[PDB]
């Protein structure tokens, strides 16, 4: 099952990351970031407007998420 980090922030965004089971990262797109629909389908559960914003290539099962503040 999926691990969800605590949240953290800049002055500009808030952030969190989610660790997927390994197995599944075969099927995380490598050459593009995911829409909301796209990541929900993997079974990620979170509020609206979190944006898949980067990939750490050596840990492709770790989805990195970011959302603007006020």
């Amino acid at each position: 099952q999926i691990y969800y980090s605590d949240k953290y922030d800049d002055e500009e965004f808030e952030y969190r990351h989610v660790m997927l089971p390994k197995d599944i990262a075969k099927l995380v797109p490598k050459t593009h970031l995911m829409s909301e629909s796209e990541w929900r389908n993997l079974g990620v559960q979170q509020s609206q407007g979190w944006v898949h914003y980067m990939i750490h290539e050596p840990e492709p099962h770790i989805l990195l998420f970011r959302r603007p503040l006020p």
Binding site: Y3, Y8, F13, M54, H56, E57, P58, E59, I62
Partner: protein, 285 residues
């Protein structure tokens, strides 16, 4: 194993199975790493052993002398002096609310620096440095174990302790690394000796980077030249200012904090060396 009786199993330190044993001539008590070597090709002579041969030479009081090396049927026995304590173990044993006596910290760090300077010095790195590698005797002496073993060779949470003591050069996918990695590790260890806590306590490579950045600031080319060229650098990283390090650690005079700050400089060309660190005001007692 002619000269040695196996007394008992005592773990699996990343390389081998580790055993306790005794020398039948001298009665000496020893630690024995048993290592099964990959079959090798015809001509191709093994650089792995070449390295180990050379590491056998090294004696210094603050390193775990590799006493002997032996060859059975394609397996390799590394014979070390037997120490029953290590620093990870030690730190765990401290009762809650108490801290390591700040002069013992200072003692320990110096000893650690001396062992690494020696190694460095001899063209040899650690790489995988961390508290379970720093052994201790009853005499209160501290010693590096497993120096240069990485070089001589090359599952996954086995990696993910090792992560906390790991330099951001290595984490960002830097083309080459050198002695500055061992100093970084030693800085992270220094902080832990004071606080009892790991300094940068990450759950993954990427969370490790982020932890480091939250405390030291997100690096750019101003603070770390050529950083933005590294294979895993990204301009999308969160943007933390420095950082605000005394913040993250108690039980060090300004000297300690300063020395520490110099051990955790991003730019490896600019990060303190082992030798310089041994002259820091911090060590005057």
């Amino acid at each position: 194993m002619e000269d040695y009786t196996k007394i008992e199993k005592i773990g699996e330190g990343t390389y081998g199975v580790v055993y306790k044993g005794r020398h039948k001539t001298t009665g000496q008590v020893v630690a024995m790493k048993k290592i099964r070597l990959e079959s090798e090709e015809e001509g191709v002579p093994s650089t792995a052993i070449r390295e180990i041969s050379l590491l056998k030479e090294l004696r210094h009081p603050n390193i775990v002398s590799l006493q002997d090396v032996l060859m059975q049927d394609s397996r390799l026995y590394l014979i070390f002096e037997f120490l029953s304590m290590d620093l990870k173990k030690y730190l765990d044993s401290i009762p809650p609310g108490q801290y390591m006596d700040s002069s013992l910290v200072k003692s320990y760090l110096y000893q650690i620096l001396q062992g690494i300077v020696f190694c460095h010095s001899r063209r040899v790195l650690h790489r995988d440095l961390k508290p379970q590698n720093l052994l201790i005797d009853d005499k209160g002496t501290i010693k590096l174990a497993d120096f240069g073993l990485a070089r001589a060779f090359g599952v996954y949470t086995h990696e993910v302790v090792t992560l906390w003591y790991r330099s951001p050069e290595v984490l960002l996918g830097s083309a080459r690394y050198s002695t500055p990695v061992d100093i970084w590790s030693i800085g992270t260890i220094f902080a832990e000796l004071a606080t009892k806590k790991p300094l940068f306590h990450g759950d993954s490579e990427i969370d490790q980077l982020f932890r480091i950045f939250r405390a030291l600031g997100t690096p750019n080319n101003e603070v770390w030249p050529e950083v933005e060229s590294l294979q895993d650098y990204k301009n999308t990283f969160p943007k933390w200012k420095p950082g605000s390090l005394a913040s993250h650690v108690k039980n060090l005079d300004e000297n300690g904090l300063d020395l520490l700050s110099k051990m955790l400089i991003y730019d490896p060309a600019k990060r303190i060396s082992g030798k310089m660190a041994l002259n820091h005001p911090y060590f005057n007692d």
